[PDB]
Structure formats: C-alpha cells, structure tokens
Design a protein around this ligand. Structure first.
Ligand SMILES: *[C@@H]1O[C@H](CO)[C@@H](O[C@@H]2O[C@H](CO)[C@@H](O)[C@H](O)[C@H]2NC(C)=O)[C@H](O)[C@H]1NC(C)=O
Ligand code: NAG
Length: 273
C-alpha cells in the first residue's frame, strides 16, 4: 500500500465582511478536496469526484457535525478576542487536523491552531495534552482539559477515529486516489504579429500530477520559454504545458515528449509545420 492523508482546515473570522462567511471548513484526501462547509449555507457538501461517490458519508449528518464544530470553534475565537480586549478588531483563528497512513499502518497525526497567523495551541498525543504557545492558550487549555476524559478523547480522535475515517474513505475512493489516468497531449502553435512562432505542448486529463513534459529540437531537449500546470479539483485531473519560441527561419524537427507513471513508455508528439 501507499501513503494516504486525511486533512481538515477550519477558518474563523471574528468580524467577517459582506460576502465572506464567518466560518469555513474544508477537507482533503491527498492532493484532492472532497468536501467543504461554511457558516452561510451550513451544509457539508462533497466536492470533486466525490460528488458521484455514494454511501461513503451521510452528508446530512456530517452537516450537524460541522455546525457543532463551528459553535465550539467560533466560541474559542470569541474567547481569545475577549482576552485581548479587542473585539473591535478583525481576527482570525485557523485549525488544522488529520492523519495519514502508510501501508495500512497509521504513520502520523496532527492537531494545531493558529491565531492571527501565529501558533496558538496544538495537541501532543504522547503526553497526552494540549501545548499552549500563546498566553490566551493557557485559558483555552484549561478549558479543553477541565475533565480527565477530554484529552483521552482528543487522543482517541487522532489515534482511532480519524484513521478509521481515513480507511473507510479509502474503501470508497480507490477509483479516485489510485487512478493512473494517462495524459492526453496536444501540440499547438501560435504566431504573434511581430514575434517568433511559439509551440505549446499540452498534457491533460491525467493523474497523478507528477509528470515530465519537454520539447526537443532535433532530438535536443530545449529550454522552455514558458511553463505551467494546474489541478482541476472538480475533475481530479491535472494539465501541464510547456511553450518554446522558434527562430523565424528554423527548419529543424520539433517534437513533444511526455513521461508519466501511467505510461508503459514515454510518448512523443512531433509538430507538423
Ligand atoms: C476536467 O475539467 C476541466 C476543466 O473544466 C476540463 O477542461 C476543459 O475542457 C473543455 C472541453 O474539453 C475546454 O473547452 C475548456 O477550455 C477546458 N478548461 C480548461 C481551461 O482547462 C477537462 O476537459 C475535464 N476533463 C475530463 C476528463 O472531464
Ligand atoms: C488494514 O487492512 C486490512 C486488510 O488489508 C484490514 O483487514 C484491516 O482492518 C486494516 N487495518 C487494520 C490492520 O486494522
């Protein structure tokens, strides 16, 4: 088996402006986002290729869960501002948590918070306890450890529930995270009035993202003039391109090359002037 990670990111603003939700949550599985939730619509919604996966999660229920998470989160943000006596200001609290497995074996877990961008508090499951980094965190810690169960629960969340959720999801996501969709390529050219002719090699509809794309001028690998790539989350696919400018009198042979993990051997696509 390989590496898999389940990450969540919560964002809360103490004085949100118009059109910006006070609370936002999102979740990822590896390099893809599978869900989202904000305090405006208050609904946990699958995203990307997960919008088509059935029976992996009861979104209606997970929404009740996010609403409850939101309440605690925003109360936390509220208490920090109350502590700095600055409710007139605009502040942010960000949370990060999740885990990762490698070869079906839990390989890591994390739970950390940031206030106005600085480390606020984080959970150390080995102790187990919260570690304050900011003075107001001393209060927060006192609250999250007011009963013996609490840390026990937090430790149980990272060591048992989270990795269980991740495994459950992997069961329904093989057709998503384990894909090896081969790249479709397209060589194209454009002549800018006054400029040289440029050739653009495009690799698309492929996954995983790791890919090798380069041109060759007479069997000679060229230095790209431009270069970019993108991940279309709704699709779960990448696109990577390269662009070379060609001398207005060059006659040499131009061919594009693509190497990807899903290919038994590299691909070549010459440009026919
Ligand atoms: C995945 O989504 C991307 C982005 O929506 C698709 O790319 C678009 O494809 C259409 C027609 O093929 C083009 O007209 C658009 O210009 C493309 N968007 C851009 C700017 O990248 C892609 O085709 C989708 N792949 C699959 C397999 O559905
Ligand atoms: C790991 O995968 C096995 C099958 O490969 C599964 O039965 C098990 O529940 C998973 N996690 C463990 C070791 O509990």
């Amino acid at each position: 088996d390989g590496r898999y990670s389940l990450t969540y990111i919560y964002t809360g603003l103490s004085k949100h402006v118009e059109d910006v939700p006070a609370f936002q949550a999102l979740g990822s599985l590896n390099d893809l986002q599978f869900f989202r939730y904000n305090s405006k619509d208050r609904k946990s919604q699958p995203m990307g290729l997960w919008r088509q996966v059935e029976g992996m999660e009861d979104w209606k229920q997970d929404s009740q869960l996010q609403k409850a998470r939101e309440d605690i989160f925003m109360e936390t943000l509220k208490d920090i501002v109350e502590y700095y006596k600055d409710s007139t200001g605009s502040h942010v609290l960000q949370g990060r948590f999740g885990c990762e497995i490698e070869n079906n074996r839990s390989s890591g877990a994390f739970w950390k918070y940031y206030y106005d961008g600085k480390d606020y508090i984080e959970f150390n499951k080995e102790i187990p306890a919260w570690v304050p980094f900011d003075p107001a965190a001393q209060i927060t810690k006192q609250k999250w450890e007011a009963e013996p169960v609490y840390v026990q629960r937090a430790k149980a969340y990272l060591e048992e529930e989270c990795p269980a959720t991740l495994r459950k999801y992997l069961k329904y996501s093989k057709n998503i995270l384990d894909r090896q969709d081969p790249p479709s390529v397209v060589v194209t050219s454009h002549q800018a009035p006054g400029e040289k002719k440029k050739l653009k090699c495009l690799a698309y509809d492929f996954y995983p993202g790791k890919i090798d794309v380069h041109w060759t001028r007479a069997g000679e690998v060229q230095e790209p003039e431009l270069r970019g790539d993108v991940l279309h989350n709704g699709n779960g696919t990448y696109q990577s391109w390269v662009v070379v400018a060609v001398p207005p009198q060059d006659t040499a042979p131009y061919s594009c090359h693509v190497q990807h993990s899903s290919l038994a051997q590299p691909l070549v696509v010459p440009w026919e002037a």
